[PDB]
Amino acid sequence: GYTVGDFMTPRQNLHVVKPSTSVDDALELLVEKKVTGLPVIDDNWTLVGVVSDYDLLALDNELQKLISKTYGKVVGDLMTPSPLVVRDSTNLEDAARLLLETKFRRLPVVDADGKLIGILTRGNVVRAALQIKR
Amino acid sequence: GYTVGDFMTPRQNLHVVKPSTSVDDALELLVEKKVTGLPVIDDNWTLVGVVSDYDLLALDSISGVDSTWKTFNELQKLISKTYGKVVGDLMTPSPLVVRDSTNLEDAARLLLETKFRRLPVVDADGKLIGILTRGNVVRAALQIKR
Amino acid sequence: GYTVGDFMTPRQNLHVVKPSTSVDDALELLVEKKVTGLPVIDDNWTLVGVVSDYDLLALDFNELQKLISKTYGKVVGDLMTPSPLVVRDSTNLEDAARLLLETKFRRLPVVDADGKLIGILTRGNVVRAALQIKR
Amino acid sequence: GYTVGDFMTPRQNLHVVKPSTSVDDALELLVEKKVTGLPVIDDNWTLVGVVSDYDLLALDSISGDVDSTWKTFNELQKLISKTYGKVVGDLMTPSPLVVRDSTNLEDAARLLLETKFRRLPVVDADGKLIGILTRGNVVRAALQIKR
Ligand SMILES: Nc1ncnc2c1ncn2[C@@H]1O[C@H](COP(=O)(O)O)[C@@H](O)[C@H]1O
Ligand SMILES: Nc1ncnc2c1ncn2[C@@H]1O[C@H](COP(=O)(O)O)[C@@H](O)[C@H]1O
Ligand SMILES: Nc1ncnc2c1ncn2[C@@H]1O[C@H](COP(=O)(O)O)[C@@H](O)[C@H]1O
Ligand SMILES: Nc1ncnc2c1ncn2[C@@H]1O[C@H](COP(=O)(O)O)[C@@H](O)[C@H]1O
């Protein structure tokens, strides 16, 4: 019965970044807001990626050298493009099944134009089950 | 030259549970204490499992070719997490663990390999002495910008 | 222009087990002959399974779980992976190498037209082939 | 009660190579000594990598997710390096997962089950190579509990 929209971390609570955001600033934001990942959007709040603390932890012949010179600079290069995402209308049980299958920490929630309206974490879902039981 | 002990959340600060603990209690404990997982210990403080929010996601309330043996086994485990009443039904028993004296970067590479949110830290008696999370390692990373 | 048949470990060299072979027996065979896995055949040498040192390593509602414990994990037939990925002696060595790369499997059993075990192609076989050929 | 050290292949029995070891030398070695992989060390016997028969399978002469930009570039360039490598450095996995000789055997065993690796190189406190624990060593250990 319940939806993603019911229990998702609302837009107002999100710590977003843009492809151009420096990897060091994403790192610092991540450590300071004590989150485990950051959604990535463009200037019109279209969701373009996700950057996990996993990605940052992973970060830390001529081809290798020219690659090293070019990346490890901006979120845009470190982010997983085209993330798996749900709708606010997506049924909550269904979403939880998606978390179970993908093992992802979070499923960003977008509208029909791919704009970022929320994030559904594991925490969201278990808290949900709790508030419901209560 | 740093180790797990330098950044692990220490024993006193840990929120633990036991296999006998009810699913309701552990859920309440995760959500109230805003943690993503809990170590599972016996009465002697011996680390016997880890239970993660991921494990909770399988609950009937929340959601919903291999050998004959592996198939049956997997299904029995699925039924157990689906209708589990105590932590023991849900946890992953015998977790991968590290020592306080494990080189920090080995722990990091273990976290990269396994993708686990956390590694329980035990002494040589297999007693629970801490928890190193991905967040701790990343915060160690930043904190060594020095 | 090299084939699996050229470099596989032939049938005559193989240590096999049957689905009725006890798991403990298989464990002993594996250790004693120092191999990492065993092909499983029936009485007519039809390849019916693979059982790996991995499977043995792994195997080493309380009531249901118990029942499952007693009923299975006794013989190879319940522990083997059924319907293994296999090749033919005519399979190009490069395609087989590439299948080893894709699947990460230690061995591809080699079977004839009737599905009878005639060999095993391991990573070792492929690496050795590369040595022998280079020379 | 058993440890990795109880069943590992010890330092004195190990076949090893370096990053600068040529692929031909390494392959020859694998074949000749009948092992499925080689620890890679530097001049001070610090463990710096592992090269496996798996890694040699990628060689041009043998076999010829949707991720971030960085990761994809790395994966490709690593694939090219393995395909055309001349030295072990081009093929090896650097910084492998490792255990201590005093690591409990069952913990090592569980690590082998989770990662599916064929072997865990065994190092001392300073990262020097002191052994190799294979899957085979573990299953043998499992049999030794015939007692
Ligand atoms: N919703 C998502 N869709 C696609 N990829 C994701 C998503 N969430 C995380 N990832 C990626 O999956 C990996 C694991 O991230 P995490 O789930 O945060 O541990 C990282 O490489 C992330 O960038
Ligand atoms: N240190 C660990 N060793 C073994 N399994 C684990 C460990 N940590 C978590 N798990 C399990 O791995 C799955 C994902 O947990 P998490 O790491 O919290 O995403 C769940 O089934 C956990 O019970
Ligand atoms: N050729 C094969 N076809 C299908 N499954 C296999 C094959 N070889 C191994 N397996 C299974 O894959 C897993 C890994 O085996 P191994 O490749 O021996 O590490 C074990 O469960 C094996 O039983
Ligand atoms: N202990 C280890 N730590 C990290 N990577 C490894 C380890 N052992 C093997 N690998 C790599 O994993 C792949 C499979 O190797 P194998 O375990 O020989 O099948 C190869 O790319 C190896 O280089």
Coordinates of C-alpha atoms in Angstrom, one line a residue, chain C residues 27-28 30-31 36 52-54 57-58 60 94 97-98 100-101 104 106 123 126-128 130-131 134-135, chain D residues 24 27-28 31-32 52-54 57-58 61-63 109 112-113 116-118 135 138-140 142-143 146:
Chain C
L27 CA 37.5 -35.3 -0.4
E28 CA 40.1 -38.1 0.1
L30 CA 41.0 -34.9 -4.2
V31 CA 43.6 -34.6 -1.5
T36 CA 41.4 -29.1 -7.5
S52 CA 35.2 -28.6 -7.0
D53 CA 37.4 -28.2 -3.9
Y54 CA 35.3 -25.0 -3.6
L57 CA 35.1 -26.3 1.2
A58 CA 31.7 -24.6 1.3
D60 CA 32.2 -28.1 5.5
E94 CA 41.6 -19.8 -28.1
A97 CA 40.9 -20.1 -23.2
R98 CA 38.4 -17.2 -23.6
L100 CA 38.0 -19.9 -19.0
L101 CA 38.5 -16.1 -18.9
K104 CA 36.6 -18.1 -14.2
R106 CA 39.1 -24.0 -13.2
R123 CA 43.9 -23.4 -17.1
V126 CA 46.1 -23.8 -21.7
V127 CA 49.2 -22.3 -20.1
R128 CA 51.3 -25.3 -21.0
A130 CA 51.3 -21.7 -24.7
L131 CA 54.7 -22.8 -23.5
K134 CA 56.2 -20.8 -28.2
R135 CA 59.1 -23.2 -28.0
Chain D
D24 CA 58.1 -15.8 -20.8
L27 CA 54.9 -18.6 -17.7
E28 CA 57.8 -21.1 -18.1
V31 CA 54.4 -24.6 -16.2
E32 CA 57.7 -26.1 -15.0
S52 CA 47.9 -16.1 -11.7
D53 CA 47.4 -18.5 -14.6
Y54 CA 44.1 -16.6 -14.8
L57 CA 44.9 -16.4 -20.0
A58 CA 44.4 -12.8 -21.2
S61 CA 49.1 -15.2 -27.9
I62 CA 46.7 -17.2 -25.7
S63 CA 43.2 -15.8 -26.2
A109 CA 39.2 -20.5 4.9
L112 CA 38.9 -18.1 0.5
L113 CA 35.2 -18.9 0.3
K116 CA 37.0 -17.4 -4.4
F117 CA 40.7 -16.8 -4.8
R118 CA 43.0 -19.8 -5.4
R135 CA 42.6 -23.7 -1.4
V138 CA 42.9 -25.8 3.3
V139 CA 41.0 -28.8 2.0
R140 CA 44.0 -31.0 3.1
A142 CA 40.0 -30.3 6.4
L143 CA 40.9 -34.0 5.8
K146 CA 40.3 -37.5 10.2

